[PDB]
Design the sequence.
């Protein structure tokens, strides 16, 4: 699992942590570098956990379709990184699983590939790379879980529950606007049915 | 057994993005070399790019027409130059302790994965030369 | 004309068991968990017709 | 922090820290030494929940047509403790566990000349689970850890909501991975579709 | 009634008892050997009780149909052991009861048999011999009863009530998947009706 | 002293001793060597009867197709047993375990000679009936 | 490099050891003759300086041993730095703790390369040895 605390702090990640800290009434921190601040370290850990969780759900902007994963030419192994939040087939039933940290074809019972496989994959991205609406939802959900675990204030719980629902709604609006899905001509089955 | 610090991919002449599975402390610790008739090492910012922390993007597409069948991604962590050096007056930090431990692990890991620089058993029961010449064999009998 | 089986993810019925079943098979599940996408345009359909 | 690093952390230690964070406790740096009851309890629950969720049965983890070879001399097939589910490939299952060995209840025999083919679920590591399934295991583990070793009832309601969402996202993963179709993917209707 | 505490502990039985102990927040024990631990001894007794109770309910995997019980050649008695959780006839109304620890034919009013009888029998099995889902249900039900009897925590009662229902549900899913029951051709009556 | 050692297989035996020190049980890898190489699983194929021995659930031998068993220590490099967290009490046990884990990988790093050609008494390069590829 | 040799027929004892070592037990001195002789420290060689080893006796090619091998073998089991709680954490001890593993890794990079290695041309440089018992 990718280390969240081992790289440079971005402005957005520092802002995200300060937003999470504010949810229980903690004052903002100037830097994310270790100053023995347990609350900030707890906030960043939940921020990473929520960042992985919402990205793993799958969205049009973050689902990579038709990606080729290449094997090692001398070991014929394709690595299944822990940063692969979801690995699927491009169509039909999926056949690839994680076995020992490498891609495994469960139908053929083999982990050896002579050529790249084409998969529908979600790869973990930085919180900085998320759309603004998705960043807000991640922070809102992280703030809600942060308050639940380390403060537990019931009044804060109720408001953050409402804010997450609104934040998820606005991410749902982003998903459809980005998606541009059409059931007539953008549909896999119906589009063929419209030919006269 | 299976090397995790050296990754080599087939060069098709049209793909320029290659995955980095292994951990690394610095982008300089990642060495990109094109293999073929010769082993040509690439430069950090003129021959390739770190598109993401796990992805290397070549500036130019290389293939058998260029004389390069494979591309190799290998971690070479510095042994003489440690990234973390503790001083008598310095606050001990979790990040500093993590980096010092991980660099030592990577140096040990690169040593344990040195079957690449020799003839070692691959996944099958075969000794693998990994696409290089056994020079100076000279006469045989 | 498109048949889309909507499976409630809060439910307990698995299409893995539904598709592998033979006719007459007894399978765990609840009929409420399985639904189908339906076009709801009858009011507009009557106006257009 | 200098340098643009790319390093990982062990998922089990991260999972345990998520379970400990759920009840408000500081994370631990390590999970060995056998002298930490929090580490022992959280790790045990995480293994218990990981084992339990895998035993439920999913398209990615139900291995179909797996052959289990008997011993050449005793003709016994070991029924492993790590066999979360063992069933026949089709119809009614006929194999049960009898004294740690596969037993054919219909023929009443532990002896097998050749290997049997079964639909088997074999325990996998928490590392080999999909990210959504890792999240559900951690959330479910955090829920029972609070119920057994913290006991705060406001935490219970929160973790009940989280696990319900964690299971729903796992259910969406099952359908996306399964890719099931009642017209052509169906075992029975596909035959009825031939003209 | 089989003694639960007189044999060597298995790893699964050690795991089960510690899971039951965890339900009220008791720390795990290294062994089930006598250390004067009243809580662990109580947990094992409830574990055995729930193990007998769920197995006696009857499932395709543990219901043995067509089993022959042989009599003693010189006494003509077939023993009705306490490990027979259920003993039925293969079809129709059952005729065999327990009378003095031996099989008794209530219709013929005799306990003497010249040859083996064919019965539908449930015989007690080790908790180690249970399917994984059934082991989880046994532990969940044992943990619920353990808390009710020896701690009585009402918050723990509610959660284990929900856990048992989910545990029983997944055991019902196992039993249907294991059974593979068909009302068309696997049916005793309807399959005859399908012949043209 | 060796982190990798091999035992000959007979149908009689199921117990094999571990000479080396391992931090975790998953660091020990059990493999059957014959015409085919097969990695064993922690519980279905074997177990840890004690800290220093492995008992196979099934006996193996020439009839099964494997004449030798290999007990190898593979300490994890990516998954480290110690990760120092900010605001955590710095314990000497954490520092020692981090030092031992890198030691174990480096100790296995000086045992690649078994997975290499090796030299003869004459000083040649002895491929133990193995083809050389690539 | 962790392995180096000196061949000195004339009367000489001093050998400047190139590799850095943490303990004197890590440096092992052998005599490469018809059969190798492992030499104890007290009887055979003194550390005149941390950089220089003064091997008692000539031990020249007049005897069969000819050249002398200076090998570094860092002990994996024994740790020079063992952290204990209640002891001042020293920057020196934190630094040396990493170094011992690195020294073992350095010794590993030479043991594998000894039997066969890779030259500066990116090719596997044989020493003029036939590939015997090779299977087709």
Sequence:
């Amino acid at each position: 699992m990718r280390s969240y605390d081992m790289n440079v702090e971005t402005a957005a990640e520092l802002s995200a942590v300060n937003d999470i800290l504010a949810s229980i009434g903690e004052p903002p921190v100037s830097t994310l570098e270790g100053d023995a601040n347990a609350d900030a370290a707890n906030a960043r850990r939940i921020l990473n956990k929520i960042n992985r969780q919402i990205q793993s759900r799958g969205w049009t902007f973050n689902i990579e379709e038709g990606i080729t994963l290449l094997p090692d030419v001398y070991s014929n192994l394709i690595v299944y990184s822990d940063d692969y939040l979801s690995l699927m087939s491009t169509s039909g039933q999926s056949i690839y699983v994680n076995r020992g940290g490498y891609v495994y074809d469960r139908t053929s019972q083999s982990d050896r590939f002579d050529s790249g496989i084409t998969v529908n994959i979600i790869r973990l991205r930085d919180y900085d790379e998320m759309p603004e609406c998705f960043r807000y939802w991640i922070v809102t959900k992280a703030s809600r879980q942060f308050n639940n675990r380390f403060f537990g204030a019931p009044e804060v719980e109720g408001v953050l529950q409402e804010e997450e629902d609104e934040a998820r709604r606005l991410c749902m609006e982003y998903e459809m606007d980005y998606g541009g899905y059409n059931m007539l001509d953008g549909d896999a089955f119906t589009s063929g049915l419209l030919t006269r | 057994n299976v090397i995790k610090t050296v990754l080599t991919y087939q060069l098709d002449g049209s793909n320029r993005d290659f995955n980095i599975p292994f951990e690394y402390l610095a982008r300089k610790f990642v060495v990109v070399t094109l293999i073929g008739v010769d082993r040509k090492v690439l430069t950090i910012n003129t021959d390739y790019r770190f598109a993401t922390r796990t992805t290397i993007s070549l500036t130019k597409a290389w293939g058998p027409a260029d004389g390069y069948t494979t591309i190799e991604l290998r971690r070479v962590t510095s042994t003489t130059d440690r990234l973390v050096d503790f001083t008598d007056g310095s606050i001990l930090r979790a990040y500093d302790l993590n980096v010092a431990q991980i660099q030592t692990m990577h140096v040990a890991e690169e040593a344990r994965d040195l079957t690449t620089d020799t003839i070692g058993v691959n996944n099958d029961g075969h000794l693998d030369a990994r696409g290089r010449r056994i020079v100076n064999l000279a006469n045989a009998v | 004309s498109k048949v889309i089986g909507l499976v409630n993810p809060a439910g307990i019925t698995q299409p893995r068991r539904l598709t592998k079943a033979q006719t007459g098979d007894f399978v765990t599940g609840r009929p409420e968990d399985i639904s189908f996408l339906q076009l709801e345009k009858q009011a507009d359909f009557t106006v257009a017709k």
